[PDB]
Amino acid sequence: SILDIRQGPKEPFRDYVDRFYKTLRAEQASQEVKAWMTETLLVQNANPDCKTILKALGPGATLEEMMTACQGV
């Protein structure tokens, strides 16, 4: 179900982040779960440009770092 939150082709990373986490909240994801989700699903469900950038940034990036790198698109 978070499986079905994928980033629109032109959607700004930031808007995709609100839906991702919004969906996570509804499902009462624990804090530990959000942290793992940030590093995995958030990346794999990003659009092809963001996905490439996030993979290039690598594991253990913070969300803020994820966003700075995906500003612009």
Next chain:
Amino acid sequence: SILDIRQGPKEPFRDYVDRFYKTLRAEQASQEVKAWMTETLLVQNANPDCKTILKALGPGATLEEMMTACQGV
């Protein structure tokens, strides 16, 4: 890093499942985290045939159900 465990184009689903959870163990994934990973990342990191079968099965399938559906192809 568990993000780097993708299923081979002809790997039996079952061998992909050992690597997935093997990798999760090394990173001391909690029980709650294995449950969420089972339903998300394990699915998206499966090969195109298993991926399609798992998505068709849907959220909240058990691992055994996932494996029965992916025996063969």
